[PDB]
Paper text:
[name]-[name]-2 infects target cells using the [name] (S), which is organized as a homotrimer with each monomer comprising an S1 and an S2 subunit. The S1 subunit harbors the receptor-binding domain (RBD) and the N-terminal domain (NTD), as well as two other domains designated here as C and D. The RBD interacts with the angiotensin-converting enzyme 2 (ACE2) entry receptor on host cells through a subset of amino acids forming the receptor-binding motif. The S2 subunit is the fusion machinery that merges viral and host membranes to initiate infection and is the target of Abs cross-reacting with multiple coronavirus subgenera because of its higher sequence conservation compared with the S1 subunit. The two lineages B.1.427 and B.1.429 (belonging to clade 20C according to Nextstrain designation) share the same S mutations (S13I in the signal peptide, W152C in the NTD, and L452R in the RBD) but harbor different mutations in other [name]-[name]-2 genes.
[name] was used to lock the RBDs in the closed state, and [name] was used to stabilize the NTDs. Only the Fab-variable domains are resolved in the map. Superimposing the regdanvimab (CT-P59)–bound and bamlanivimab (LY-CoV555)–bound [name]-[name]-2 RBD structures to B.1.427/B.1.429 S revealed that the introduced L452R is sterically incompatible with binding of these mAbs, rationalizing the dampening or loss of neutralizing activity. Overlaying an ACE2-bound [name]-[name]-2 RBD structure with the B.1.427/B.1.429 variant S structure showed that the R452 residue points away from and does not contact ACE2, suggesting that this substitution would not affect receptor engagement. Our results indicate that the B.1.427/B.1.429 and WT RBDs bound to ACE2 with comparable affinities, whereas the B.1.1.7 RBD had a markedly increased affinity for ACE2 (34), validating the structural observations. The 10 RBD-specific mAbs experiencing a 10-fold or greater reduction in neutralization potency of the B.1.427/B.1.429 variant relative to D614 S bound poorly to the L452R RBD mutant, demonstrating a direct role of this mutation in immune evasion. The structure revealed that the B.1.427/B.1.429 NTD antigenic supersite is severely altered. The N terminus is disordered up to residue 27, as is the supersite β-hairpin (disordered between residues 137 and 158) and the supersite loop (disordered between residues 243 and 264). The neutralizing activity of all 10 NTD-specific mAbs tested was abolished as a result of the presence of the S13I and W152C mutations. These data indicate that the decreased potency of neutralization of the B.1.427/B.1.429 variant results from evasion of both RBD- and NTD-specific mAb-mediated neutralization.
Author numbering:
A (entry chain L), B (entry chain D): 2 to 105
C (entry chain I): 1 to 106
D (entry chain F): 27 to 67, 81 to 137, 158 to 176, 186 to 242, 264 to 344
E (entry chain E), F (entry chain M): 2 to 123
G (entry chain J): 1 to 121
H (entry chain A): 345 to 590
I (entry chain K): 394 to 492
The structure:
Amino acid sequence: IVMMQSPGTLSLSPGERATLSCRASQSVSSSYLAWYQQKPGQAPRLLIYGASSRATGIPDRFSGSGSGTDFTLTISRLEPEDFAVYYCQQYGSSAWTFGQGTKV
Amino acid sequence: IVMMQSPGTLSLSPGERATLSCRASQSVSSSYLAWYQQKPGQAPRLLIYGASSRATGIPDRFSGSGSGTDFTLTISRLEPEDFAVYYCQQYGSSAWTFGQGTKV
Amino acid sequence: VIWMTQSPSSLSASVGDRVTITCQASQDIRFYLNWYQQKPGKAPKLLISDASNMETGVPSRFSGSGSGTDFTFTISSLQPEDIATYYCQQYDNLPFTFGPGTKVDF
Amino acid sequence: AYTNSFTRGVYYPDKVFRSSVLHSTQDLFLPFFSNVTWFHANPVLPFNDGVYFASTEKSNIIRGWIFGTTLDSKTQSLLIVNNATNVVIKVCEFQFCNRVYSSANNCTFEYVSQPFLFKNLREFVFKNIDGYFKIYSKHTPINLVRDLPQGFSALEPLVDLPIGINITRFQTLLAYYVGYLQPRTFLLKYNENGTITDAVDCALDPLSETKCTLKSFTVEKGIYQTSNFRVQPTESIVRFPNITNLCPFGEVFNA
Amino acid sequence: VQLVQSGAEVKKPGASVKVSCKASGYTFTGYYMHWVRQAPGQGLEWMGWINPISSGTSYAQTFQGRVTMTSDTSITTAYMELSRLRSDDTAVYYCARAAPFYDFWSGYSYFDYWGQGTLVTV
Amino acid sequence: VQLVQSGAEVKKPGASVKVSCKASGYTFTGYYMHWVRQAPGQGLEWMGWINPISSGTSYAQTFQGRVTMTSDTSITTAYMELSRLRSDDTAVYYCARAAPFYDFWSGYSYFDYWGQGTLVTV
Amino acid sequence: EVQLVESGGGVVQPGGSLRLSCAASGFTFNSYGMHWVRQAPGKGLEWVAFIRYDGGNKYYADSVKGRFTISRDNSKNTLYLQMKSLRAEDTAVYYCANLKDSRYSGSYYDYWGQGTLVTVS
Amino acid sequence: TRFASVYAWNRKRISNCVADYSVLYNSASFSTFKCYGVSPTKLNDLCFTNVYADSFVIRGDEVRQIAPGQTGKIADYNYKLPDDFTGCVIAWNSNNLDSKVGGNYNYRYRLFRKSNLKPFERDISTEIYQAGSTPCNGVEGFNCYFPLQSYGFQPTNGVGYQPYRVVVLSFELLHAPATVCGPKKSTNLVKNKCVNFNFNGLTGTGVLTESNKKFLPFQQFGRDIADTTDAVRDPQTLEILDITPC
Amino acid sequence: NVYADSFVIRGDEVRQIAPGQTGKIADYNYKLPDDFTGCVIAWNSNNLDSKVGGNYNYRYRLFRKSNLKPFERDISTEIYQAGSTPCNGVEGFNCYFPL
Ligand SMILES: *[C@@H]1O[C@H](CO[C@@H]2O[C@@H](C)[C@@H](O)[C@@H](O)[C@@H]2O)[C@@H](O[C@@H]2O[C@H](CO)[C@@H](O)[C@H](O)[C@H]2NC(C)=O)[C@H](O)[C@H]1NC(C)=O
Ligand SMILES: *[C@@H]1O[C@H](CO)[C@@H](O)[C@H](O)[C@H]1NC(C)=O
Ligand SMILES: *[C@@H]1O[C@H](CO)[C@@H](O)[C@H](O)[C@H]1NC(C)=O
Ligand SMILES: *[C@@H]1O[C@H](CO)[C@@H](O)[C@H](O)[C@H]1NC(C)=O
Ligand SMILES: *[C@@H]1O[C@H](CO)[C@@H](O)[C@H](O)[C@H]1NC(C)=O
Ligand SMILES: *[C@@H]1O[C@H](CO)[C@@H](O)[C@H](O)[C@H]1NC(C)=O
Ligand SMILES: *[C@@H]1O[C@H](CO)[C@@H](O)[C@H](O)[C@H]1NC(C)=O
């Protein structure tokens, strides 16, 4: 499988809304799609699991959605802290696969 | 209803015993009589509820008693901290009423 | 038991005036409200059912609407023959209840 | 206008095959020799606990039925409509006109099958139990003009629809007869092919109770005990002591 | 248990003031929130209560039509708003906690916890 | 939950490196430990997992025969060892936690906790 | 023409009893549930009781429950109300009615009688 | 994602499908799995006419109330099972989903009611409860209570005060065509010999033969006077078979 | 004769050590008969059996093909097949370690 994110880089002002995309080469169950956030100099942290469920301690400013081959992560109002790299992650056939990542 | 406290002001040395009074214009159930302490620059705190029961964290130096129209708060041995304003409080007929207060 | 309230308890209006009567339920009764018109010495007549459905024979000047707890009865242009006491009644559940009644006069 | 439905409106109470046996069952049946209303046309009628419907009109005269509560756009309603080739049954937020409806929002159920409808008398029974709308029917030849046919004919299950809605009123879509079902006890006679050929309404009269007590459709000469009578209480009377002081429970609890 | 109130306010006549009280350390909807007023050099006056679970309220006759109380369970906070302000509305305002009326041991009759008050000058 | 990893390492080609991850704040044997690699300027690659209760493992096809994973429950610590090192094995290595395969709500499909990574230069 | 005719009113003493009846005609009585509604002098309408079409299930207002009994005879097209332990507060004009109700009775028409006065004194 | 409050419990009707109950029973994820009127190991062998799945949230200490013959605020005023209940009660800790810092006040239960609920009765009204002899007229105050209360779930609560998600499966077994069956595979039909049989949930022993009994399309089986099935319709071929003892 | 059986479980599971019980312990670990004659004795051993970071020596069976018969003992560690596909002794998807 291949996980494809877009756009490679996004730029917008703080306080505005951002949307990031992730496309799969094949159908992915919604339960097997997750999103991670990685700030500079830090390990990745889980934001969304199961396509639409937030991880513990994550602000409701974040949400996710999608099915089949196409998924999307939404950031409603960006803070100075949200300008990080985001990844989508898929599970299937006894393997875990990450997208190439996008920089906000 | 009217709640009347006496004496308006009391003065005595530390280490001595003090008694304060509260008279009602009509009978008050013992369960509906309470006492509060207010130090300078502070909100009131509960000392006695239900006429004779101490609030949590209140020293056994304090006690209360009474029935019908006449109730009394006793301070067995005064500390420098006990020279505060005291109030009696009554409940009835869907309203809460305070006495005018007395200063120790 | 669902408590029914009406407002105003009484209103004065002239011929040609718009008359609005409010009925409120203490519980959500969906759209299960009847409106009745009663004149002295007579049994009540049904004007509106299911909150907003007009009865056959009822003049087009009568109307009503609402859902849940807040309902309104309206006469777009009061006529001389519309002088009566109006009641709202819920039939969402038993026991059934009527409101206080609103008296309309000149 | 009323007619006497002599012993009409009997249907197979369940899906169990029985033969050469007299079976006593409790269910909603049209009471024998009841007064059935004879309508000419088209008013909205109460559904009550179930409806017995019969007509001698052609299939292009009686089109079907509407079942529901407010029978408007505020609630779900059941619409059964026949045409030349099929029958269409739907449950939606229908807004009915006066070709039947102008709109049908929030549709939750749809079913399509074959048409439901000397002349030929058509009999239907409509029940609504635990969310299931049950329809029974029979089609027989008739040589009568002003009344219902005599003789016994049981109605078979036609369809069982998991609609899940409440029905309190209904209207016929366009002469016909309407009766209502009651909780009765019937003794049903199954022949060697498992067909119901007769029945006894156990509350019809002293003779019928004797027949039901006996599990037999014939009674020999004699005297038979069939039941017991008992006078029921007119009212309840309470006689306690007239003391008024309350028990001091609070004193135990708030020590 | 903690009750934390908003800071002091200064207003002119005819205006309205809103005081907040944030609660923590207990089940918010399990208690009534009362407001009590204290003018300079004076004693204590009860204004009314709000029940967060029902959003039901009751007010003292003195403030009927003048005061509105609200609450927001998502932030466990209660608010008191007093309109048509006058110079004699200058006082320290307190939020205080008491049991609901269904309390078997009459915990509704007294106030067991107080926030430190908010000074309002008109 | 905390995951604490060993410090950075510098190695030459053909050698082997071992990275440790100490877990605390949860039942160690109730979760799988996964390892994820990140080369400079690149994204994330999954290497394999170990199940401490059974000492069972599974690896990605890329590292099959190159990597070994072990664990020691007495110190709630997992280890990843990569042999026959090459210059393109330079990366930050992370340990991450996920549910076991018998998790009813598919908690195995994602990594819920991460250790701060260990930098390995070859 | 649809008619509902109440009868059996009159004057009784407190603690006494009175039985009302309502003769129905012009409609299929035995297909509809029926209600009793009362209106005290100078007061609004108050619902009293409801009976189903077979006479099987009966419902009462809390203010009369245990004192009033509702019944019907479908062979006589007649509705009955038996009132026991009558109080001064029970003085009212009593109506029999078929109230339009899309939830319970299933009636699509609304019928009322002229009403009969019951006085307790 | 979202579960109902217990006073406003959700119900889903399940029909016309294959039900594998072992995937639930053999799970490691459920703290409670209790069956009544049926054993969990036999569920996959059975056929039912309907299955209902009820779901809601309660606190841990209350899970014991979700059983036949129980009393307490939940059994009495919120969710009541029948005494002849047939079904399974499944529960698990949801502290990780349903609790929040400061308290989650979305989950509520009924605290006061005039009378106990009947089995499977639902009550979602919010009228004021009259505790005293004096009418409330819809106003909350002395002897006049708001009937509902919140749990206020917080992650630091003791286990008895943490949220639990509950699913109740009730099995409807009427004399009607079964629409929900376990995943048992069918075998070929064997006639004129003594065999054990299982026809859409109906088990027994005997010899099967072609029947001359004229079943109507709705009829699925016949019975004798001993309440024993003496004929069945085969669920796949719709053939009518006689059953006689070996 | 008298038999004395002994083991460690967690506090919430003590109720399962009785006749007519269900659950992971009663079902897969230690099962009493319904006509059992005997006594069940238990005490808290937090002071002996717990340690900082966790004592992982005490284990229980989580999965099994069928329930144990009364007084049956099972100490095998074979992979549990949850799915329709054989595991061949390998742990993974639908293939669990039983303890
Ligand atoms: C302790 O209880 C007594 C008895 O009151 C009863 O039980 C209580 C728990 C509560 O349910 C009351 O409403 C019951 O009446 C209390 O004495 C009664 O108080 C009420 C007013 O609250 C008064 O109307 C009654 O006349 C009193 N009864 C008697 C015999 O005097 C008493 O006040 C309680 N004391 C405390 C501190 O709670
Ligand atoms: C049917 O109605 C007639 C009056 O037309 C009446 O005499 C007869 O008793 C009624 N029969 C039944 C069963 O109601
Ligand atoms: C009867 O109704 C069905 C379903 O809408 C339709 O397909 C069919 O053409 C109709 N028959 C006629 C003669 O209109
Ligand atoms: C009807 O559909 C709307 C969505 O457009 C939905 O919100 C509403 O709840 C539905 N009502 C019913 C009775 O299904
Ligand atoms: C039963 O059906 C058979 C045909 O299978 C027929 O010959 C017989 O006459 C029927 N019995 C009766 C009483 O009609
Ligand atoms: C349908 O409505 C009637 C109204 O009398 C009610 O008694 C009955 O219980 C309702 N049926 C269901 C399944 O709710
Ligand atoms: C499945 O069962 C139906 C009857 O319910 C039958 O008509 C059909 O032929 C069967 N299919 C197969 C492959 O046997």
